[PDB]
Symmetry: C2
Subunit: 330 residues, 2 copies
């Protein structure tokens, strides 16, 4: 079997639906005149354009059939997160979005699994929604990797992860709200430079802060896009830890020894990069994920893993066995 | 023989010397009471602490002897760059610093080679200083990777590279003035996350802008710290180029085919990372560099390359043959 655990959806939100939350900043879906194409919209401005797989579960199942994908795990498009909104409205939005998600999966719940969003700007509302959404059928949570200047080392975010650990709630960490300022204006550089750095920063924030010494081993947490540049730059981190006490202040063993505390997806778009990723993380900690249905995703889902020279046993773990245990999928 | 082409020096600048340029922002060297240790100072504030190899060429030669380093190429500590200063004062500073550099190397010019800094905020003064410093004995230029929000795709920086290409002046691009804002305050995260992303951004800015279609092939340009995360994230860039026209707008062939237009040093602190780097760049485009004498450099210079499983022929190119041709060292 084949599980793709990194994909996105966007719900059929109407303009008036979104305006009952925020006419200016709540996103909504316009399935335009040709109907094949949408804008995610913000207010009446256009946000970015999308196509039908994002919103149509029937159309998506036929593509999954064609790709040979048996089970796809899907979650919010990050524009849905609403982390800057007033907390109570953000909690109402998260519940609505997560209900939308379960309705998406209800067309074929054996083949479409969903993860939930949470109002991460209020720790109490976010823990309550994580528990509520998983009890209603979600298999885990997808969060952005940072909340403004608060990275994953911040006690509020560590506490959210620890809540999920203690309740057996898996987490997918997705880069969002990219660093860079007024640079990287062209050629989608935020997706090529800032996004892998954001994910590396999230992983290193947990490691170098000592958070894994405090978060229970029960935490199942995965980072998108192969963990960004984390695995390649890990030697540089270990060398810094060895030679500067301020890099060691909160992290009692070499940073690379914490790779047994998290997972990555396999979306690194290159055979050598995947071999290095599996070398660093272990065949038990890399899961097939495509970023379907976005253009910077993998067109032939699983093609990189399937055409690799990894062991047949490792190929099965990455394509199916790891996600099956991580998300409890049969 | 062994050439280390990535290292730094800082000159014996006195507080009054620096104040004749800028009492607040010109850096200077305080060889403190125990004399083993300095602060680079800024005004009367402390900038950061350094040790004697940075400023003492005699002491440095004995360490090079112990390490088995025959020739070391050395250049300004980036705090010396002065890219935010008024241009004419910055040009006076660059000339003074580059004279300081040649005095450093004059104790043993066969074993200590220097690269120059330039007042990059004025293209004309920067080209004139590049030519002047190379004519006086410098083997090339070291620049920061960006000038504020101007990355290497900016016409002014492309024109500086093209000047150097046309005059057979090699360039080392070093990350500096790191992105990140108010994040990455702890555990030297700017050096672990922001620095490799800065260097990747510089390389991708040249590639995706089409600059290599305009800059002559004669350009010899090397990027520090293995090119940052560039080689690992290259598959993701090629995939984006294939699937979004705005990533292709200015770059007429797959981004990965431009690796024959630049070099990287070998400082990636991990055997698998070095194997991937050589796979991507080619054994002819990776040069031994240590980041001596800084703590996030390589303590045993050349140890990673020498203990690798690369061919004996590839080991010689990386340790000596490539830098010898790149910088014209005998
Ligand atoms: Zn995604
Ligand atoms: Zn350096």
């Amino acid at each position: 079997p084949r599980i793709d655990m990194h994909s996105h959806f966007f719900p059929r939100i109407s303009e008036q639906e979104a305006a009952k939350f925020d006419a200016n900043h709540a996103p909504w879906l316009q399935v335009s005149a040709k109907g094949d194409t949408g804008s995610i919209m913000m207010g009446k401005n256009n946000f970015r354009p999308v196509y039908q797989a994002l919103w149509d579960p029937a159309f998506r199942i036929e593509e999954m059939d064609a790709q040979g994908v048996d089970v796809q795990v899907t979650c919010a498009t990050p524009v849905m997160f609403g982390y800057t909104w007033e907390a109570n409205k953000a909690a109402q939005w998260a519940e609505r979005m997560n209900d939308f998600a379960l309705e998406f999966a209800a067309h074929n719940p054996q083949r479409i699994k969903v993860l939930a969003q949470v109002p991460l700007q209020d720790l109490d509302l976010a823990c309550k929604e994580a528990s509520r959404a998983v009890a209603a059928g979600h298999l885990g949570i997808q969060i952005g990797n940072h909340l403004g200047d608060k990275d994953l080392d911040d006690a509020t975010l560590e506490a959210f992860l620890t809540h999920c650990a203690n309740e057996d709630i898996p987490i997918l960490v997705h880069p969002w709200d990219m660093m860079g300022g007024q640079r990287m204006k062209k050629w989608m550089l935020p997706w090529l430079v800032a996004m892998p750095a954001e994910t590396q920063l999230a992983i290193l924030s947990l490691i170098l802060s000592g958070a894994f010494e405090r978060i229970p081993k029960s935490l199942k947490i995965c980072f998108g896009h192969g963990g960004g540049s984390f695995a390649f730059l890990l030697g540089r981190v270990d060398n810094a830890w060895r030679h500067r006490d301020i890099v060691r202040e909160d992290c009692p063993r070499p940073p690379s020894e914490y790779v047994d505390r998290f997972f990555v997806d396999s979306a690194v778009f290159n055979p050598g990069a995947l071999e290095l990723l599996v070398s660093v993380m272990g065949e038990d900690r890399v899961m097939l994920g495509s970023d379907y249905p976005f253009p910077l995703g993998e067109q032939k889902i699983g093609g990189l893993v399937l055409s690799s020279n990894l062991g047949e046993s490792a190929k099965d773990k990455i394509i199916s066995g790891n996600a099956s245990k991580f998300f409890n999928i049969n």
